[PDB]
Motif scaffolding. Structure first.
Motif, PDB file in Angstrom:
ATOM      1  N   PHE A  66       2.934   4.645   5.204  1.00 48.83           N
ATOM      2  CA  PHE A  66       3.019   3.318   5.963  1.00 48.83           C
ATOM      3  C   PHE A  66       2.758   3.268   7.271  1.00 48.83           C
ATOM      4  O   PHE A  66       3.187   2.730   8.173  1.00 48.83           O
ATOM      5  N   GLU A 104      -1.506  -9.142  -2.017  1.00 53.12           N
ATOM      6  CA  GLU A 104      -1.358 -10.453  -1.458  1.00 53.12           C
ATOM      7  C   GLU A 104      -2.822 -10.850  -1.134  1.00 53.12           C
ATOM      8  O   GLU A 104      -2.968 -11.880  -0.306  1.00 53.12           O
ATOM      9  N   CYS A 128      -2.220  -1.194  -0.186  1.00 54.90           N
ATOM     10  CA  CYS A 128      -1.837  -1.810  -1.702  1.00 54.90           C
ATOM     11  C   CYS A 128      -1.273  -3.357  -1.189  1.00 54.90           C
ATOM     12  O   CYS A 128      -1.471  -4.251  -1.928  1.00 54.90           O
TER      13      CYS A 128
HETATM   14  C1  CLR Z   1       6.575   6.508  -3.054  1.00 54.70           C
HETATM   15  C2  CLR Z   1       5.900   6.271  -1.859  1.00 54.70           C
HETATM   16  C3  CLR Z   1       4.436   6.277  -1.822  1.00 54.70           C
HETATM   17  C4  CLR Z   1       6.389   4.788  -1.528  1.00 54.70           C
HETATM   18  C5  CLR Z   1       5.382   3.649  -1.963  1.00 54.70           C
HETATM   19  C6  CLR Z   1       5.453   2.286  -1.252  1.00 54.70           C
HETATM   20  C7  CLR Z   1       4.831   1.240  -1.970  1.00 54.70           C
HETATM   21  C8  CLR Z   1       3.695   1.891  -3.173  1.00 54.70           C
HETATM   22  C9  CLR Z   1       5.631   0.120  -2.569  1.00 54.70           C
HETATM   23  C10 CLR Z   1       6.885   0.277  -1.692  1.00 54.70           C
HETATM   24  C11 CLR Z   1       7.320  -1.278  -1.558  1.00 54.70           C
HETATM   25  C12 CLR Z   1       6.366  -1.977  -2.604  1.00 54.70           C
HETATM   26  C13 CLR Z   1       5.925  -3.380  -2.215  1.00 54.70           C
HETATM   27  C14 CLR Z   1       6.985  -4.451  -1.804  1.00 54.70           C
HETATM   28  C15 CLR Z   1       6.813  -5.767  -2.318  1.00 54.70           C
HETATM   29  C16 CLR Z   1       5.467  -6.139  -2.808  1.00 54.70           C
HETATM   30  C17 CLR Z   1       5.055  -7.692  -2.741  1.00 54.70           C
HETATM   31  C18 CLR Z   1       4.458  -8.310  -3.726  1.00 54.70           C
HETATM   32  O1  CLR Z   1       4.212  -9.587  -3.637  1.00 54.70           O
HETATM   33  C19 CLR Z   1       3.329  -7.340  -3.993  1.00 54.70           C
HETATM   34  C20 CLR Z   1       3.873  -5.805  -4.190  1.00 54.70           C
HETATM   35  C21 CLR Z   1       4.425  -5.236  -2.976  1.00 54.70           C
HETATM   36  C22 CLR Z   1       3.586  -5.305  -1.811  1.00 54.70           C
HETATM   37  C23 CLR Z   1       4.964  -3.914  -3.690  1.00 54.70           C
HETATM   38  C24 CLR Z   1       4.063  -2.894  -4.144  1.00 54.70           C
HETATM   39  C25 CLR Z   1       4.578  -1.407  -4.127  1.00 54.70           C
HETATM   40  C26 CLR Z   1       5.169  -1.208  -2.554  1.00 54.70           C
HETATM   41  C27 CLR Z   1       3.958  -1.450  -1.752  1.00 54.70           C
END
Ligand code: CLR
Ligand code: 7T8
Ligand code: 7T8
Ligand code: 7T8
Ligand code: 7T8
Ligand code: CLR
Ligand code: CLR
Ligand code: CLR
Ligand code: CLR
Ligand code: CLR
Ligand code: CLR
Ligand code: CLR
Ligand code: OLA
Ligand code: OLA
Ligand code: OLA
Ligand code: OLA
Lengths: 375, 375, 375, 375
Positions: A56, A125, A120
């Motif tokens: 992040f 989005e 991602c």
């Molecule tokens: C295990 C570790 C790598 C944490 C991974 C964090 C990522 C892969 C996770 C955490 C929060 C998640 C996001 C939160 C909600 C959204 C908004 C949606 O409209 C698109 C997907 C998206 C963007 C998700 C994609 C996957 C995500 C980004």
């Protein structure tokens, strides 16, 4: 046919009122509790928060780049429609919002060197907002072929957990704030579960690919070793993002027809799996590519359209990964295509399940190898 | 109270008619299919049949020792009862032929150096015959306190999947030979599943304890690494031996009340888990130790009897392991006792599940360490 | 007395339906158009976007620090109330949310070296959330002195343009999306107007204070030169943030009693100006400090309470500036206090207007001197 | 059509009874009070009375030249009409005493080297007397085309705030000497306001044009710097001389129809601005040049007459400035003409306002340059 919305309940939620599924669910939280206790006890003699803080990296930038795209998709398509349905510019303006949420999320992702997880977000989005900024348009244009939908409906639509613009959306009495709090708590617990699975069962096995041999024994046993994080990643993706996230957002907004997924775990054949997994994107994709395909082509041949839709899905997903991990390594599409060819040229549920397991195993293995041989 | 038998059906079987449990079951057979494909592909560049052929070393001797046992428990108890209830030597006969089933299965196990798996057979068979021979006697004696049960019933009783001698046993119309064939096929598939789990996820981690460090990090991470074979061993033991084996034998014999287990996976507290896991031995143990305890002691204090029964169970299980692996290493009883003390002196289902996981993890870890530091 | 809410209209909006105020408004947009044309024509032989890009330095960080404080004020006060009104922890937990939106917005503002404009955001979202996280509490506690308000109301309350927690809030029929679009367009045009005023009429005069003289002629003529950006900054602050911003947000939410300001431009005396300027914060401040003051003190003397409230306001505003510009230079409070003393110890509207003009002139002059003598 | 007089009241006076305009008015007097305090404080360490004492150099001569003028226009027109309407010398008398008011005010202005402000008096008085003497004549001649108005009416007419000779003039009950005292006090306060604006915001910027560069950046930024004294000079000219001066003189004389100006600040287009700004001269000009034009020409084409009237106005105003500042520099007419051409060949109120602002900015800039490059 056009999809019509009922006040049905998300299938897993109508299962979870049964006790035995409350047990399975509890077994899985117990799994998390063992991981947290064991990792806390080991790292004592801090945590694996490193993957989170790393993944992040520029999350601030990732969100202030989410705002421009959101404002573009909110204003550009509606103004385009409202002025275009007043007899103009509209034929151009629609173009800009093609180019702003297509160019910007790449420029801020490549030119600023974002991590995978904070990238991602933007990937998702720009294949949301095209899916809707287009759904909305192609829904509300044939209304104007008559020789302007209420904006409030379009705002509500951009956040509603469906991709079909229906502007009716059967709604529920009130907001169970206890239920949405529970759903978000589960979704965040799920992210933490995935954080442990990666930081404990993926990084250690895959870190040492600098190793010279490239022996086929080593690779194939790495694939078997990695097939299990593969399945838990899939189940977590599914559970959190298709039951927790979209129910939470379907409870804040008082949305009906929460059938975002049918029981894919019962899908006898593969096509059934793909139709009943992520039913929201399937229904968008189904509706537009399989009721504009068979309309414009007017082709008696439909099998062409089935594979047409599915390669559209595959290409989109390949693009998503090609963007996130910053590779050009298209393993998933080759797998899907080749076994597509295999079964479509040349108790039955079990074969599907086994091939899904190896599908997951191959994808996770080769993507970890590619991420740790490009670094 | 005395347990009374109904024509209810094994809980998991009445669940398996629901589709979603057919799915879970299919997911698990798919798991087996991945293991067989991957291991076949790895050992190609033969199988892990070595653990089977090693573990069943003198299986011929193990069975020709089972026969004298079975004949002793078949004849000695009945002849004793029939002659003893004829007014003698019975008091001497039983006491003299309670030693054959106590001395022989140790003498042929230690003096001939049997492997673990070919030994556990005789362990279970000596405890099994002790249990149900004593049951039979203490059931049919108070009938003779009146100032001889039909033999065919006693023969049938020795093979019937319950330990309570009721000589009624509500029976079913006919023998579904398709169903019993299916159940045995599953039980043998289960043994093969356990063979893979051991030969793939236990031997490799635990082989290298000749390693000098004995660092607490290494041990604790070995415990976390080994907790998962622990749970699959438990689930396999449970499924095969309490659903497949006893249903198969309850279908060949046309037995009713096939509630050999209640839903232990819903047990809120721990005592409930122990009462609803292996309900057959629980009911024997419950009946005799908790309705001769509270009769002979006549004690207003019952908590003493609850722990009394449970340490009888723990001591029996400790003895079983002390015999099979040929150690004197009583880890399980210390764990059960200590946390017994912990919770009984000083959503709730999850804590039980987490402590069960670590219970399994510790037992499998320390027993693998002890088996590979005594060899 | 307690303030009670009517469906009255924001006073300037009920004036703007008169034509002559549409003219004045048009004159001011014409002023902007002259500035943009002249600056575009000069800087051609790019723009003053530098002040914007500089002043919003880490705006991403400023917003991802806004999220934690918003989640803290959303959850902590409500859970505190709900559990505290269940007979606890609540007496502590309330403390944490005192310390999270008090410590965090300073730590991220000082330790990361934010600019002024990207800092003020956080300043304002820690003297909002205390004003409400306290208003809400002190409103809904005396309900529990009876020997739990609906959460949805509290969520709605956090975004509602008033600081008083009334949980009735008289609402309007529907959302005039044309009107809110217009109001945001004006608010952003207003920010651009302020950007020009600073980058054209403040920076040039004040840049050259490195100059040695410090002659009283030079300083006093700088004060007269700077009094006009002072008044336009005030009018812009007022118009945009009290008519455009809060009306826009009172139209998205369908809020009534949009009397966020009475006609302060008619305030005969000074106290009247302070009561009728930013009436929302005045009413919060009035209600709590002047109906807990005169309750707890029970003091027949009220003049003490008038000055009490006003020094609370002055101290809060001094703190806001002491935070934003990173000084400890408290000019405003000394001015307000000293002339407070002057008029309260020792056609009338004009004197107030003249002293307000010089108030603005002194504040802007000395703050520009302090910002360009600390850099 | 001929203009007919009602007992309507000066639009701004009927607005000033509303409170918010009393506020704006008070804000402007507060502006004056800040200027007087700041200038008094700066010049202490005397005032800018120098511009007044310089600009009114030979004001005694300017007034004793006003007297011969006033006597000529009082006697010559009337005696000519009275004798000419007696059947002579009148045709010679008027033509011979139209030169006194044309030759004298130039001879005493150039040959005696008067300042600007003491000269503009005679400029306005010669154009004023030409205008209303000719009006009187052309009104009362067609009465004599029948094959002598009361003198007292003509005397009263010369001082009456209209240029149309109507000899009815609807009158008011009595003389509000408080009101006229107030209006003169405002008019003199207005002159003092203009004195400060010039002596503070025009002289300093424009004094240093002896500077060599003549760089286009320097000139264009001088134009932007000078646009604001431009607008305040216009607003002051307007307010004092069209609301204060003519109301004061319309209250001493008990005159009705005090619509000397309609709301020009609401003029959507430019022509409307010119018709509703200084409505008295407009109505004279309108009546005579646009109801003798369309009578004598009898032209179906009227647009010719619209521009005809407006270039008559422009030429007159250019002449006024060419006389006062003693230049031959006709900037205003070129600006009016060119943008006249621009809009008449090739929310809308705002464009007019912006172009008026730049019109003022250019005129004040170039006239200050010309006055300080001719000295
Ligand atoms: C295990 C570790 C790598 C944490 C991974 C964090 C990522 C892969 C996770 C955490 C929060 C998640 C996001 C939160 C909600 C959204 C908004 C949606 O409209 C698109 C997907 C998206 C963007 C998700 C994609 C996957 C995500 C980004
Ligand atoms: C590289 C990456 O980011 O993927 C993360 C990961 C979890 C994804 C998440 C992804 O989720 C998304 C974005 O959809 C998902 C589930 O989606 C697809 C899509 C298709 C598909 C569908 C239709 C047509 N053609 C192809 O095939 C699949 O089996 C799967 C997979 O299971 C994947 C994976 C689970 C495979 C294992 C992966 O892990 C790693 C580290 O590589
Ligand atoms: C050493 C051995 O032979 O055990 C094999 C193994 C599988 C057993 C099978 C055993 O099965 C039998 C004989 O019943 C079982 C399930 O039975 C008990 C009994 C009690 C208990 C109950 C009441 C009172 N006191 C103690 O607590 C437990 O959790 C368990 C455990 O889970 C075990 C184990 C699963 C633990 C993991 C073991 O694996 C290894 C290699 O060590
Ligand atoms: C340093 C800063 O950030 O201020 C920006 C600025 C615009 C503020 C905005 C501010 O807005 C806020 C945050 O409220 C405002 C309007 O608020 C107060 C508050 C009080 C007051 C009220 C009650 C009791 N005691 C004191 O006195 C005032 O006259 C004013 C002023 O006019 C200011 C200013 C306009 C004065 C001129 C300033 O410009 C510079 C560069 O220094
Ligand atoms: C050089 C001079 O004496 O003018 C003084 C000054 C104030 C005048 C006063 C003048 O007042 C008079 C005599 O009427 C006024 C207002 O009158 C006209 C006339 C026309 C016009 C109208 C119809 C047809 N063609 C042209 O256009 C204008 O915008 C304006 C201007 O605004 C000017 C000015 C305000 C422009 C700025 C000037 O300041 C300096 C120093 O140059
Ligand atoms: C919050 C943390 C513990 C994540 C929990 C994940 C669990 C609760 C979710 C994620 C994926 C889900 C599983 C995926 C699909 C199936 C197959 C079906 O035939 C039985 C239910 C079952 C097994 C689901 C039960 C609930 C489930 C296991
Ligand atoms: C023949 C081979 C594949 C062995 C198969 C083992 C499977 C089918 C058996 C063994 C243990 C059993 C599981 C143990 C208990 C539970 C928890 C309950 O809440 C859901 C069912 C579930 C999950 C059972 C489903 C069936 C099961 C998983
Ligand atoms: C995974 C590898 C080690 C295979 C293990 C084989 C052993 C542990 C398995 C295979 C067959 C099983 C046996 C078959 C049936 C019986 C008869 C019953 O009255 C007592 C238990 C007993 C004796 C079982 C105990 C466990 C068992 C012996
Ligand atoms: C969008 C850009 C141009 C900003 C516009 C600012 C203008 C339209 C706003 C900001 C401050 C406002 C002014 C402040 C208060 C007064 C005093 C009152 O007695 C008359 C109205 C008047 C004069 C307001 C009119 C509208 C106003 C001038
Ligand atoms: C002229 C240049 C310096 C631009 C100035 C930008 C700053 C001063 C402006 C632009 C946007 C404004 C912010 C937008 C809205 C909010 C949210 C509100 O709850 C607190 C005030 C706050 C935070 C405003 C404060 C002033 C603000 C931050
Ligand atoms: C005596 C001194 C202070 C001179 C005072 C000048 C003031 C009071 C006069 C001169 C010019 C006048 C302004 C010119 C025209 C307009 C535009 C109109 O839409 C609102 C009123 C307003 C703004 C007038 C208000 C009164 C006014 C501002
Ligand atoms: C600011 C400084 C330069 C003061 C300017 C003084 C001049 C421009 C002002 C002050 C008094 C005004 C004069 C007083 C009244 C009249 C009589 C009228 O029939 C013609 C206009 C005329 C002659 C005015 C023209 C403008 C005027 C002369
Ligand atoms: C093939 C690409 C898959 C895209 C997945 C799209 C997810 C479902 C789409 C729309 C419904 C989601 C609405 C709720 C999320 C709001 C979150 C946000 O806007 O930040
Ligand atoms: C604590 C020790 C646990 C003992 C487990 C006993 C298993 C259940 C006992 C009796 C019912 C089994 C009857 C069917 C098996 C017959 C097998 C055989 O005779 O070879
Ligand atoms: C003395 C400090 C002054 C504080 C000003 C507070 C502004 C008014 C307070 C609350 C109503 C505002 C509600 C609408 C703004 C929502 C913006 C956001 O949450 O980002
Ligand atoms: C184009 C030139 C503009 C001429 C402006 C004329 C001013 C209005 C004309 C006549 C009405 C004025 C009557 C009151 C002033 C009398 C002053 C005096 O006689 O000294």
């Amino acid at each position: 046919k056009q999809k019509v919305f009922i006040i049905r309940k998300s299938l897993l939620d109508e299962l979870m009122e049964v006790q035995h599924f409350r047990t399975i669910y509890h077994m899985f939280i117990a799994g998390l509790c063992v991981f947290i206790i064991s990792t806390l006890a080991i790292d004592f003699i801090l945590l694996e928060f490193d993957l989170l803080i790393f993944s992040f990296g520029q999350l601030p930038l990732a969100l202030v780049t989410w705002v421009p795209m959101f404002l573009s998709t909110l204003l550009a398509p509606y103004q385009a429609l409202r002025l275009w349905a007043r007899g103009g510019l509209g034929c151009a303006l629609l173009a800009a919002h093609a180019v702003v949420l297509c160019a910007l999320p790449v420029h801020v992702a490549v030119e600023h060197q974002l991590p995978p997880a904070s990238r991602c977000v933007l990937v998702f989005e720009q294949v949301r907002f095209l899916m809707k900024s287009y759904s909305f348009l192609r829904e509300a244009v044939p209304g104007i072929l008559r020789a302007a939908p209420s904006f409030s409906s379009y705002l509500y639509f951009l956040f509603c957990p469906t991709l079909i613009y229906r502007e009716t959306y059967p709604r529920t009495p009130y907001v169970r704030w206890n239920y949405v709090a529970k759903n978000f708590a589960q979704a965040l617990g799920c992210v933490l579960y995935a954080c442990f699975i990666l930081g404990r069962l993926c990084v250690p096995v895959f870190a040492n690919m600098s190793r010279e041999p490239f022996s086929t024994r080593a690779l194939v046993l790495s694939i078997l070793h990695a097939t299990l994080p593969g399945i838990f990643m899939l189940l977590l993706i599914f559970f959190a993002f298709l039951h927790c996230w979209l129910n939470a957002f379907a409870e804040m907004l008082r949305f009906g027809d929460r059938m975002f997924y049918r029981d894919w775990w019962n899908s006898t054949s593969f096509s059934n799996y793909y139709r009943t997994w992520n039913v929201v994107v399937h229904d968008w994709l189904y509706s537009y590519v399989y009721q504009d395909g068979l309309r414009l082509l007017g082709a008696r041949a439909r099998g062409v359209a089935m594979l047409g839709v599915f390669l559209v899905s595959a290409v989109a997903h390949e693009y998503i990964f090609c963007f996130v991990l910053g590779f050009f390594y298209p393993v998933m599409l080759i797998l899907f295509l080749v076994i597509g060819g295999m079964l479509n040229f040349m108790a039955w549920n079990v074969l599907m399940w086994t091939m899904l397991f190896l599908g997951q195993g191959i994808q996770v293995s080769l993507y970890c190898q590619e991420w740790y041989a490009r670094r």
